[PDB]
Amino acid sequence: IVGGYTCGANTVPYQVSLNSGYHFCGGSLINSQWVVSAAHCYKSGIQVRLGEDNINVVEGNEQFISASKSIVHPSYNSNTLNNDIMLIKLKSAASLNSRVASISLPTSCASAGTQCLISGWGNTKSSGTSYPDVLKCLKAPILSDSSCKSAYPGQITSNMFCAGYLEGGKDSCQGDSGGPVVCSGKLQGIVSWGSGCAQKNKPGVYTKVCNYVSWIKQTIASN
Ligand SMILES: [Ca+2]
Secondary structure, three states: OEOOEEOOOOOOOOEEEEEOOOEEEEEEEEEOOEEEEOHHHOOOOOEEEEOOOOOOOOOOOOEEEEEEEEEEOOOOEOOOOEOOOEEEEEOOOOOOOOOOOOOEOOOOOOOOOOEEEEEEOOOOOOOOOOOOOOOEEEEEEEOOHHHHHHHOOOOOOOOEEEEOOOOOOOEOOOOOOOOEEEEOOEEEEEEEEOOOOOEOOEOEEEEEHHHOHHHHHHHHHHO
16 A cells, blocks of 8 residues: 555454465455455465454464465456456354454445545555555545546456546555455455556556445355
8 A cells, every 4th residue: 555554453354364475465354254355366375364463473363264265257357357356265264353354245336436445565655665564544535437447548347446546646556456445334346456556647446346246145155
């Protein structure tokens, strides 16, 4: 996250870290045994880390549970990033409290102009590399589809949206991928791609979760 603030320990209780010997992508806890992430984070051998604040210190609230199964969206296209969404089932159900909780799936798509919260452990610089060890948060608006398509001519599909600031300075960044964008207490986005971070006229691009709800629910019901 570039340009954001330190969330504070377990203030974002649905936020997960996907670990394969190291933190590589974020994710969102959607019920006790399922996590939603970005299809571009797919790896074999993922462990899910819940209850984290400082990913490099064991502080007391953590649950580390291996993934049993990972499902990439049937239509995921790695060259376009269209349908950049993945389901991970946990080997065991998580124990859900105030500090480890699931986030609700949306009923409606959120509109341009809505303010959302984006969080993760990604790079905090627009030029060069500096990874935080604690969880970083950004409030940012959803931009209009017009402003989005006009920043990224030819590249935006119906299953994406932009959010952030055309002036730059504040965005998501490398390592924040697969993490949540939550608006009005619902999961509306997944951190997916962008051109660099926090650059002028190159907002972050996010998977539009409200398009996938029927897919999510059907998959979870059957697996
Ligand atoms: Ca920790």
